[model samples]
Target: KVFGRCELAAAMKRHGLDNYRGYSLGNWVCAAKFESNFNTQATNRNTDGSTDYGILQINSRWWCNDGRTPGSRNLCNIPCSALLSSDITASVNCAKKIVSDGNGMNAWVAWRNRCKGTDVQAWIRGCRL
Candidate 1:
């Protein structure tokens, strides 16, 4: 939760994920900003009874298992709790898998609803990407 926008960009860039899968580093940074404010331990519950995890707010019903939730599809093969940690590697990997599933960042409601059609470049400005 302590990461600034630039810090998050550095971590993603370190993993060579800043522009992976045809998406821009700004897009990733914007999504992270809107989704979790770069907070790794962030979690939110959806109205439909599903849970969101990590910086990208990946869903438990479709992506990871939260242990407390049964019948989780676990498409990411990761514990939802793992996503809610200081380590961003697993979360980033799962995010790539999510983007690959089709619809790109549209899979994330936050990306679609908040970051889309906006001046997302500001999310990474001054970061020297």
Candidate 2:
């Protein structure tokens, strides 16, 4: 499902991403914007054959089992397909795990390049919060 900016922001906040691991709600919202543009079914395959899945674009090589990545750790212990669901609960949970696993938001190049150190408040400006 594609989410409006405010809709995505509210969903992430409900899942405790709002200050999760020192990243603010705006940071999470911004990351989602650049990573997948709020599209839950987004997917991108890497040159190594591992693919990124879902709104946050969780990686198959390290996070989820796609049954294709040769050395998938499946640290999230979930199938990559779960990330594509419109529910978003799995996506949000795995994202929290990714941040706590030492990558922080740096796990997504989109975040590092587009959202990091920026005034991401605009990402959620119209949201009621």
Candidate 3:
């Protein structure tokens, strides 16, 4: 499920994610870069023992379900595998819910930790958004 930048950008645009909720495409694109580097199948184990899933790195502890994990709110009500596919419809939809509930892109720690305050335009440079 590894993908190049252009492919992911096109999918974002096709999904109208360039500026959902007034967040710039750079915010989403840059978060995805550090979160999972555009790998749809990416999974990261957290210190809290939860797993981060998919390109946006949605957490199983609060977002999706992984069965073995604890403290899963499963607010998205999606199988963890749903976020692992190359198709990002479910992932984006889930992310939309998260952003609506959380502090915009701050829900993505990757964005808060690294992408915040930076000129993230380079994330979509030459992508012709």
Candidate 4:
């Protein structure tokens, strides 16, 4: 929901990262800064979880399954509405894991890699945390 840094910080504070240091909102912002220049409405089709669109880069597939229909949810409001949904953190974590063990670009890129006839799995294996 176009949450401010403080709002994101609060969400992260509640989640506690569960020993995942630096994976908080700040870290996510930084990662996005590097990967997509902090574009909250960042959309990408993921191979595993679902399609991602928004701050935590949640998968569109997940969001739709989360009781919110893709058509009902305003895609333009991704940053302020869907991005900060409860699913973002977990979705991002899954993406991070994929990126950590696979492509550094997250699941969306992985999907494209697979579609592009590249050895997506092999490339993912090359990805190390």
TM-score of each candidate structure, all chains considered together: 0.92, 0.97, 0.94, 0.36
RMSD of 2: 0.7
Worst 10 residues of 4 by lDDT: 120-129
| Tens digits of lDDT, candidate 1, 5-113 | 8999989888777668888888888899888888998899987788998888999898998876667699989889999889899999999899999798999888889
Query: Which segments of model 1 are wrong by more than 4 Å?
Result: none
lDDT of each: 0.86, 0.93, 0.88, 0.42
Each prediction's RMSD over C-alphas, in Å, is: 1.3, 0.7, 1.2, 10.8
Best by TM-score: 2
Candidate 3's displacement at residue 5, Å, is 1.3
Separate clash counts for every candidate: 0, 0, 0, 6
Q: For model 4, how does the per-residue alpha-carbon lDDT over 1-129 read when each residue is reduced to its tens digit?
A: 354444444554455532243233344434433333344556565555355555545455433343333443432323334454444565454444444543344434423433234332232232222
Better of 1 and 4 by lDDT: 1
Candidates, ranked, TM-score? 2, 3, 1, 4
Off by over 4 Å in 4: 18-25, 32-42, 45-50, 58-129
Q: Comparing 2 and 4 by lDDT, which wins?
A: 2
Give me the displacement of residue 106 in model 4, in angstroms.
8.3
Model 4 / residue 33 / CA error / Å:
5.6
Task: Please give the distance, in angstroms, between residue 15's alpha carbon in candidate 2 and its true position after superposition.
Answer: 0.6
Per lDDT, the best of the predicted structures is 2
